[PDB]
Design a protein around this ligand. Structure first.
Ligand SMILES: Nc1nc2c(ncn2[C@@H]2O[C@H](COP(=O)(O)OP(=O)(O)O)[C@@H](O)[C@H]2O)c(=O)[nH]1
Ligand SMILES: [Mg+2]
Length: 177
């Protein structure tokens, strides 16, 4: 995919969503863009958001399941303004792989990319395998924002995408982007 010219006065933020297979990356995308959950046929989902009164299009790229069998292509990472780095709170091994995903994002995306750490599947509290505090600590260590989300119930999904956008916008307005 290649996005077109951005209309004057508006913004376009390319997002990526990375993490182990099955953590809910695709469901997060669709919950945000479509407000639906159905346990993706497209390279990306798009949605208009409003940040500081401005029109900002978020174009959220999906890995197309490639991480289940091969490396993620460099083209996927390129030009991203935002990344959700996702693990599944019910599976510790997905939390163990965060450092490796983060290192790849930092190797292949712009240094200015805003990364939010996401512990997904918060609705499965009885199956929790990673404590909230562990996610919080990882985020602090790596200078990331952190939320727990449920793509299923939509808990914190809007906030994850919008708060990431607010931060990108803040960096732009500060010339730090
Ligand atoms: N209970 C629950 N299940 C989820 C959630 N997010 C995703 N799933 C389920 O997790 C599985 C993997 O989701 P998917 O979006 O394909 O993960 P991806 O491989 O990381 O893109 C599917 O069976 C989803 O229905 C969530 O927040 N809660
Ligand atoms: Mg997927």
């Amino acid at each position: 995919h290649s996005s077109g010219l951005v209309p004057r006065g508006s913004y376009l933020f390319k997002y990526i969503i990375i993490g182990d297979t099955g953590v809910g990356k695709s469901c997060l995308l669709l919950q945000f863009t479509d407000k639906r959950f159905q346990p993706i046929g497209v390279e990306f989902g798009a949605r208009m958001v409003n940040i500081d009164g401005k029109q900002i299009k978020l174009q959220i790229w999906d890995t197309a399941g490639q991480e289940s069998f091969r490396s993620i292509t460099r083209s996927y990472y390129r030009g991203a303004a935002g990344a959700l780095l996702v693990y599944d709170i019910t599976r510790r091994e997905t939390f163990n792989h965060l450092t490796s995903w983060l290192e790849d994002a930092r190797q292949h995306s712009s240094s200015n990319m805003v990364i939010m750490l996401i512990g997904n599947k918060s609705d499965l509290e009885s199956r929790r395998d990673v404590k909230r505090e562990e996610g919080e600590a990882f985020a602090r260590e790596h200078g990331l924002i952190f939320m727990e989300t449920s793509a299923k119930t939509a808990c914190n999904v809007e906030e994850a995408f919008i708060n990431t956008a607010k931060e990108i916008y803040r960096k732009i307005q500060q010339g730090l982007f």
